[PDB]
Amino acid sequence: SLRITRIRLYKTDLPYVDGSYGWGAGNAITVARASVVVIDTDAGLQGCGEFTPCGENYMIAHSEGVDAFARLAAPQLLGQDPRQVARMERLMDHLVQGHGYAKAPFDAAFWDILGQATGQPVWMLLGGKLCDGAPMYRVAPQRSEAETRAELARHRAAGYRQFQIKVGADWQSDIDRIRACLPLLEPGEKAMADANQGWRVDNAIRLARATRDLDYILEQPCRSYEECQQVRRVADQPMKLDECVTGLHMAQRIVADRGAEICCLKISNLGGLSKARRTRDFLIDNRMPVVAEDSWGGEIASAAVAHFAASTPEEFLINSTDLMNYNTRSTGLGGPTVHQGRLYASDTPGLGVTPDFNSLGAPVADWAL
Amino acid sequence: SLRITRIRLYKTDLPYVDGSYGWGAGNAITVARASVVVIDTDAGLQGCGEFTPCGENYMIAHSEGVDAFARLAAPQLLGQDPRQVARMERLMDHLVQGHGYAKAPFDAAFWDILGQATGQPVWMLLGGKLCDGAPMYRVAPQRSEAETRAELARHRAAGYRQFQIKVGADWQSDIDRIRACLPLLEPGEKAMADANQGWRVDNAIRLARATRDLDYILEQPCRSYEECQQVRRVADQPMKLDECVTGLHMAQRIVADRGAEICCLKISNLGGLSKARRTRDFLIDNRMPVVAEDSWGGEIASAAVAHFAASTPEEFLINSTDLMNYNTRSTGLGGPTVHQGRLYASDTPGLGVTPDFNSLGAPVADWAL
Amino acid sequence: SLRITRIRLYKTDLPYVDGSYGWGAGNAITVARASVVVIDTDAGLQGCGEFTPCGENYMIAHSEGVDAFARLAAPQLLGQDPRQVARMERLMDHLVQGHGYAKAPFDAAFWDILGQATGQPVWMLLGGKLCDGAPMYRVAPQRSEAETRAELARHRAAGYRQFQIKVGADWQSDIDRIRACLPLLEPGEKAMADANQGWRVDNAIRLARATRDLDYILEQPCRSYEECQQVRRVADQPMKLDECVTGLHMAQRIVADRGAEICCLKISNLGGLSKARRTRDFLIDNRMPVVAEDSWGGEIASAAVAHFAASTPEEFLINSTDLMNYNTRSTGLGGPTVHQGRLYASDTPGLGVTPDFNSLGAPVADWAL
Amino acid sequence: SLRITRIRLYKTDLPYVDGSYGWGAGNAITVARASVVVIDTDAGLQGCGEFTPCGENYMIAHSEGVDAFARLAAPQLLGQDPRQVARMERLMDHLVQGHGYAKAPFDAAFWDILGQATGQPVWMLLGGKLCDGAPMYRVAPQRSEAETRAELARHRAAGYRQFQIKVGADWQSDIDRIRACLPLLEPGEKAMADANQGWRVDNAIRLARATRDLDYILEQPCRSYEECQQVRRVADQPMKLDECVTGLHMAQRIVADRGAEICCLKISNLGGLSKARRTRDFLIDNRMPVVAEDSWGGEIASAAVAHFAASTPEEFLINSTDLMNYNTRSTGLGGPTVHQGRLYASDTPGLGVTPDFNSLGAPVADWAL
Numbered sequence A, B, C, D: 001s002l003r004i005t006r007i008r009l010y011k012t013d014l015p016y017v018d019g020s021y022g023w024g025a026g027n028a029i030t031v032a033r034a035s036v037v038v039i040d041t042d043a044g045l046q047g048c049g050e051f052t053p054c055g056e057n058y059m060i061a062h063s064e065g066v067d068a069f070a071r072l073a074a075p076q077l078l079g080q081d082p083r084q085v086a087r088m089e090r091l092m093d094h095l096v097q098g099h100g101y102a103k104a105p106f107d108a109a110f111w112d113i114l115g116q117a118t119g120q121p122v123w124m125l126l127g128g129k130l131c132d133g134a135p136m137y138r139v140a141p142q143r144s145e146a147e148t149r150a151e152l153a154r155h156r157a158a159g160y161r162q163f164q165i166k167v168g169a170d171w172q173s174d175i176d177r178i179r180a181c182l183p184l185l186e187p188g189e190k191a192m193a194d195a196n197q198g199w200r201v202d203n204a205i206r207l208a209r210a211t212r213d214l215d216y217i218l219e220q221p222c223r224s225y226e227e228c229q230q231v232r233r234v235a236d237q238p239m240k241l242d243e244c245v246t247g248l249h250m251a252q253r254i255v256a257d258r259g260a261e262i263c264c265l266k267i268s269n270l271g272g273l274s275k276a277r278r279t280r281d282f283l284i285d286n287r288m289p290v291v292a293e294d295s296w297g298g299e300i301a302s303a304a305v306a307h308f309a310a311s312t313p314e315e316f317l318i319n320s321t322d323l324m325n326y327n328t329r330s331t332g333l334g335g336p337t338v339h340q341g342r343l344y345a346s347d348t349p350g351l352g353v354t355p356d357f358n359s360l361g362a363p364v365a366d367w368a369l
């Protein structure tokens, strides 16, 4: 028998590593606001979760929305059994409809507590270690042709075989970016051109027609699924859908249409690790390749990502990412590690992460039974 | 770290409690043939699982198929970590395609071992106790109409408030059998008419038109999904689909069509608890009412059923049944308990059931290292 | 009048002529396990049939399943009239649902008995000799450039005009294999790239795109039909479906969608010569090109293949294969022949084959009336 | 080895046993014009076939069309092997397109020859005796309440349990016919209202709505399939489709829509026994109830019908009919028999009928090798 005796909410800043990070149609990242949920039990077990967006207009999700949900839910979540992850899921969904991003860090703490109570890592409770090290990608580059060929060779020797070309702000120069990058990677390598919902549908098509002879992954060219499918009418490139993959309902529709070659799964865009796990399991059973990820964050959100990716079948997992190494600051102590281009989950009980209390500060809100 | 060190296959007879069990187009269960899989490990943890068909021609499943599969798979499973349920699932699926019924006892034994290794019941590893005592039904087999009135008094006495009327042997007398049964039930009580694929489409339509002024659940009127949809065109009765619900592919088709009011989920028909869980979770998310069951069997089969039912949201769980109480003989020691017409899962680690070695006899096959 | 008086089951090892057979996503048939069914009658007419899998995970079928089926069904088949193939078909399908592969050798033995009782070869009862010598293909060859050009020349000289490029284990080098083999063929000639369910959907699309300028038959690129259709969205190459063609239900779907250019018909994957003939005749009437085959096997299986091929209209028959020539051991005495790259059925009554009792050994099971 | 040496065409009058035969929207058949084909071989095996329309405007078929087909095709069939029924089918279809009704007597004669060459009845060559005595219907009656009771009592005692009401000339009084006939038959019995393509779609709907509380079979209410489907939008009655079922293509459409509860199969409307068998087997595999019959005719047409019925699975065979007993004159010697309201095929080799050369008179056309 277990009871939740306390809920606290922490908030901190996570500056970008380079200082400047561009995405989509001219968006700006410099500081990302983190929300850390800490849940305490009468047996002295404590779990932590995290939601951090990559921009406040990236998905149907913003940083102040975690506080507002917690204020309604946390008094109603006190005295309840936290290792019963699905029971907590249904209770949080009975308290407020939608708002999945805000429930996400609570759910990760519940999975963390389940892991500690069972003496097992989170990947074990998600089915086992189906992937020994998730493959990763490098977000490189932007620079000169001679510098690009050098930096790709530094990524190649480090073990990276997959590269993201960040596009979506100017379809015409994006054509030039794609055309110049692809002869610079060698035979076995993957390039994904992510527009981050950035192109208008006509301009997306012009780019597809101009790069029709080329082998790359066309990733989220437009905002809606319907615009993306309209681009797909012309585009033969393996299409990766990301921001529009908001849950099981959209996954069902992507499957019904065979509407993408890769589905990108962001844990908090799917509304928590419980819902993210169910969407991937559905997509895997329908033999759809997936990426296992979250929007942004430090060690705590990255620990959930690592366990999500390790529990994905190796045959169908395209990549994952090391979200904690995109920041100069931290949210938790521990989390996942990176070894030779691959992302590895912890094998210790729970999420393998505890809150970095000194980085976060005193809690901004607090509910004790 | 854990390894499978021994696999034993057991076979035993399970005689029916009321002599004959009339189901379908003229079939009968007097003695059902149980198949029990016992898995040993190097840490001394033992898991067990059971498949028992309710008739050898009922679904795409028969008792001798378990032996056949076990001969092919069991040497390949020795030395493997049975706690990693999804890894075993994919291993078994890599070794043979389909034949899910035969993989089902092995899958139940893994969830048993993982349960013991975590110190938790199977319902906790399936999400939590989302239902505290599954509302039960009792099947009233194909007998005379004067002696099913007394059987519905006998089953109501045992605390059941839901009754499955076995029909499907003759549409004409089945109309009479339905019309006589319905005014013999009190407020709050439900009836389902299960034809067990027995009716021809034209006859099923005739039955549906003749009983249009009545409230009962029309269950699997014909063999195929398509046939049942042809009936549904005319039949306004809530339709339960059962035998044709073979997996997630069918679940997807049923949801796309909104093709039933109830989907029955038999563990062995879905290919084990791992796959059953996922079809359950998919249907609940699409707000399809479910029944959590298996085909037939003793305490071991019933243990997996009870944990499956307990982790199903009570809002969407129509019923389950106590399979172990249909037989005069046992497969297991322990298992689930029933109290006032509700089925309760065990709260002890693992499945909460061990093999009844004295009832089972010497194993028919034994693989060790 | 005729009655089955004895059913015997034989099992034997069929080793591959060239050691190992590399198919699909990295699989190997070093030794195949043959299942031979032998049926005796009260007029002393004997029938025989064979199911042998090309890998135990190739389709929904394994070698131990025949044994399992026979144990349940054979006591019920004694005393029954084997000439009446549809009655026997019916009976089997009443005893078990699905498991068509296991029913397949029984069905072939019945067609064998009907042929002997009517004094006609099996092709005659299948409709007549609609093809005089079925075209064949060679697997060809994974070698040098000169050694390939020379080995294709000797197969060409021997009468072969069609070649199978075995692919499916590595999309990237599979591109190279297709690109290197096509300029080595001359122009009346046909290449089929069989991935054997090997590719992930995205990689199959990459391959199809990189070889869009090339004329070849793209064969079963992915596991499921839906995945193959997703590849077909992009690939203009004639598509051959094979392992997903499991029955009439699927053929209807394929025809409705116009979803392939060639349908590959494996006798045992269709559930026997009775269901294979009906699926064949359905596709032919809808003007779909067909291949007439089976999974694997000796002379007994090949005899069923040859008569199946001989009764396929020449205009729509793509090829067949000499399965008996892939092994170093025999299941049968007699069987079909190969002349100038073409497969010829026997013209003597029945299947044209008797069991090689010296090779088969002691029967593993024997039921007598 | 066998060769067609001689083809003869005969023509004869078959007067209706009860004067005039009222069907559809104002049609009457008093004398039907039979076309009998007689095929001789070099081994002295003779085969016969028959097509007789029930009215020249009944289906896409008339009596004079057999002559026309024969004059074009018969010189091209001399020297051919008649036992190879699919080779003959495909030769005919190569010589002319469509006109299957005219090919139908030739097809029957080839099945006759094959049965003689193999020493087996045609039902054996169509799979076996899957129905022992096909159930029959009586087209009765059409008169007063006192006279209908006496007529249904003699039919009941004679074994009949199924009754056709000939309607379709006046929807308004067809409502009254249905309404007055249905309560004059007991629990087990059945009744089909055959409008024989006769109602206009709005009138068919008015009839459907007026009788929406009644248990009968709505048979071919309108001419086209689409008109029938429009009626079916409103009509919950089991729908029987007949004249519009012209072949496999239409049977595929019917299956896809699940657009009927019974399909009526007329051998000559399907283009002969070969296509008729393939269409039936397809519908039975899709679990559609069928009627096995033909348009009209004497002992030769009825022999083919009885063999067609006998090889239809009894679970799915609704009824058949004794065509020879509707006429006062003969086309053949032998044919099927009737006992206790069931139609029985012959067990002797071939069709079980020879041409009644004395009734047929001089051959109208004669082709010799």
Ligand SMILES: [Mg+2]
Pocket (backbone or CB within 6 Å): A194, A219, A220, A242, A264
């Ligand atoms: Mg992205």
Ligand SMILES: [Mg+2]
Pocket (backbone or CB within 6 Å): B194, B196, B219, B220, B242, B243, B264
């Ligand atoms: Mg049921």
Ligand SMILES: [Mg+2]
Pocket (backbone or CB within 6 Å): C194, C196, C219, C220, C242, C243, C264
């Ligand atoms: Mg193939």
Ligand SMILES: [Mg+2]
Pocket (backbone or CB within 6 Å): D194, D196, D219, D220, D242, D243, D264
């Ligand atoms: Mg009719």
